[PDB]
Write a protein that binds this DNA or RNA. Structure first.
Length: 59
DNA sequence: GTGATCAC
DNA sequence: GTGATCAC
């Protein structure tokens, strides 16, 4: 899914930013919770990075 | 190790 | 084909 709501992330370049993830999904093995993951673009570098989403962020 | 995703 | 993303 593409996300709508912004997320507080630490960028690879070291900054606090609020970014809307371009894709989001659940990353979990069988029997365990895992995490939710967002695909983000650092607007300072144009570089792509992944980052944990809050547990209640909608997929 | 396991899970999904995709820019590189 | 894989790095890198986390929590268990």
């Amino acid at each position: 899914s593409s996300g709508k709501k912004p997320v507080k992330v630490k960028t690879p370049a070291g900054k606090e930013a609020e970014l809307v993830p371009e894709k989001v999904w659940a990353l979990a093995p069988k029997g365990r919770k895992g995490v939710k993951i967002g695909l983000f673009k650092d607007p300072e570098t144009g570089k792509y990075f992944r980052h944990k989403l809050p547990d209640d962020y909608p997929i």
